[PDB]
Ligand binder design. Sequence first.
Ligand SMILES: CCN(CC)S(=O)(=O)c1ccc2c(c1)/C(=C1/Nc3ccccc3/C1=N\O)C(=O)N2
Length: 348
Amino acid sequence: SKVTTVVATPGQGPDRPQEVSYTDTKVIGNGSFGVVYQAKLCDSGELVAIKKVLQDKRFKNRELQIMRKLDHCNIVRLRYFFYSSGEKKDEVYLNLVLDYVPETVYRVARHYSRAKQTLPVIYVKLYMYQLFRSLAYIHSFGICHRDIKPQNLLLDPDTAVLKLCDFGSAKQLVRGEPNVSYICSRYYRAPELIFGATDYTSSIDVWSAGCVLAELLLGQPIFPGDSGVDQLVEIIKVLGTPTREQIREMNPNYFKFPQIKAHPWTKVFRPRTPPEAIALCSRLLEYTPTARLTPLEACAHSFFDELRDPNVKLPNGRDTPALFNFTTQELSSNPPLATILIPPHARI
Ligand SMILES: CCN(CC)S(=O)(=O)c1ccc2c(c1)/C(=C1/Nc3ccccc3/C1=N\O)C(=O)N2
């Protein structure tokens, strides 16, 4: 039975390369970036995922740079990295070895969707709350993810622990230094990007989070456009034509549209949708980027009260994961929020 030994650098520790041995290799994902494998660490039998990407020798890998910095319970941890050869000989591949997690928010929601059901709202709150924590943490470093969607939210369904993954589009955003407008997956892409903004902020991640939340409530994407222009048309059918001031706030440059009225929020969603879910969604899916809640404010929204109840359990009987162990860094955008975020029973 085949074992592979490589010399790998620890993700967060000091740059002393070390021998790492793994076995039980299988393909579990792929994309334009390259390929993702599952493997088992001989060391501790622990399962990991190995993401293998092509390395341009002109420039450093920004994915690697960003992932080395990250240490959070709701973010897939970079354990090691190493270099190898691969398919296109005389080329160098970067291998990222990450926490392995067996499900995605997308897969779980599709199980329900295929059965013509929607996910119980307790799971919607657990997932969305963990998404907003991981966004609060990355945004506190100025890092924007730029590809928030259900497929990038890994899940352990026994524990309900969620971890953000795929930092392939992520970037440190610097005020006055321009960024590409054509990013994010289309269904989740903020309107200021559709309008060609290059000066956008971390708030585009919040718009994407709002789209994930509405998909969970609806059982299908809320804005399924076939192109960028048709993406705006989908957005408009629900939100109405953006006003002049809204366009200005989105892109101080970028027309006359068919004047179309906002669809009432309550009838976008199924009859019995909790009002608090709808009110949250409306404060995420705003045209004016500055009007959207921050990640930390989203966590403190009433929609998530049930998670702060001392007697709350997962449906399967087990205790909820870590939800209240906020750090100084996490709270930094708005320290007084801690009084809400950390309930009395979680301080002790
Ligand atoms: C989805 C995000 N990626 C692109 C495939 S990724 O950055 O390469 C990436 C990175 C670390 C990762 C993963 C994916 C990952 C994944 N576990 C899974 C289990 C079932 C189906 C898909 C995945 C999956 N991925 O589809 C995992 O356990 N650690």
